[PDB]
Design a protein around this ligand. Structure first.
Ligand SMILES: [Zn+2]
Length: 215
C-alpha cells in the first residue's frame, strides 16, 4: 500500500500493520511512520520545514492522530532541516546529545539530545530502540531498531542495493564506518528488514553491501 501527495514528492508505504515508510524527494530520503495507540512517531522527518510540515500533515490526516515524537538519526541539514516545524507543533525531536550539538553548530534549533547510546522508547505498544553504533556517515549517526518486527532503520549509514556511492563523505568517518556497521550486525543477530537512508527496503544484505562499498 503506497499513498502519495499531489506533486509525488511525498509518499508513504506500509511495511506492516503499524509501520510505514515515508519517502520524500529533496533525491529521495526514507524514514518511518509508526502508527501507535498514543499517536504517530516518525523515524526522521524531512529535508526542510515545508516538506516536514507536509509530511506531518499527510500522516496526521491519514491516521487522524498527532505526531508526538520524531527520532532524528543525524544532524545534517537533510535530517534536522524540519526541526523548526517539529518544535512549533510540540513534536518531541529525539536525538543524541552529539546530534543536538552538531545541529546547533549547523545553526539549527536544537533537538532534545536525550538519546543515549542505547535508548529504548515505547509508544503505546510500539517498541523502538535507538542505537549509536559509532561514527560512519557522520560522527553522530544512529540506527533505530523495532524489536517487535526486527526492522532496522539504517538511515544514511546504510546504502541501498543499487547504490554504488556512499554519498557525502565530507563529514564521514569512512574507516570507522565499517566498524560501526559491524557493531550493528553484532548487536542485532536476527534482522528482518533494513531501511536504507534512501532506496528500497531490504534486509541484512544491505549492511553487507554497504561494507562492500566501504572496502
Ligand atoms: Zn547526512
Amino acid at each position: 500500500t503506497v499513498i502519495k501527495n499531489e506533486t509525488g514528492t511525498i509518499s508513504i508505504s506500509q511495511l506492516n500493520k503499524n509501520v510505514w515508510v515515508h519517502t520524500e524527494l529533496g533525491v529521495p530520503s526514507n524514514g518511518l511512520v509508526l502508527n501507535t495507540s498514543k499517536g504517530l512517531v516518525l523515524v526522521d522527518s524531512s529535508w526542510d520545514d515545508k516538506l516536514t510540515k507536509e509530511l506531518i500533515e499527510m500522516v496526521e490526516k491519514k491516521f487522524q492522530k498527532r505526531v508526538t515524537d520524531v527520532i532524528i538519526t543525524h544532524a545534517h541539514a537533510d535530517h534536522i532541516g524540519g526541526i523548526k516545524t517539529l518544535k512549533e507543533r510540540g513534536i518531541k525531536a529525539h536525538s543524541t546529545a552529539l546530534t543536538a550539538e552538531l545541529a546547533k553548530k549547523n545553526g539549527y534549533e536544537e533537538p532534545l539530545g536525550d538519546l543515549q547510546t542505547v535508548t529504548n522508547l515505547k509508544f503505546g505498544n510500539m517498541k523502538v530502540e535507538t542505537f549509536y553504533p559509532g561514527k560512519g556517515h557522520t560522527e553522530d549517526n544512529i540506527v533505530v531498531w523495532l524489536p517487535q518486527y526486527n526492522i532496522l532503520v539504517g538511515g544514511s549509514l546504510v546504502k541501498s542495493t543499487s547504490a554504488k556511492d556512499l554519498g557525502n563523505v565530507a563529514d564521514a568517518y569512512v574507516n570507522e564506518w565499517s566498524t560501526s556497521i559491524e557493531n550493528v550486525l553484532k548487536r542485532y543477530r536476527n534482522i528482518n528488514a533494513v531501511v536504507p537512508g534512501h532506496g528500497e527496503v531490504g534486509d541484512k544484505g544491505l549492511l553487507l553491501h554497504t561494507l562492500d562499498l566501504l572496502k
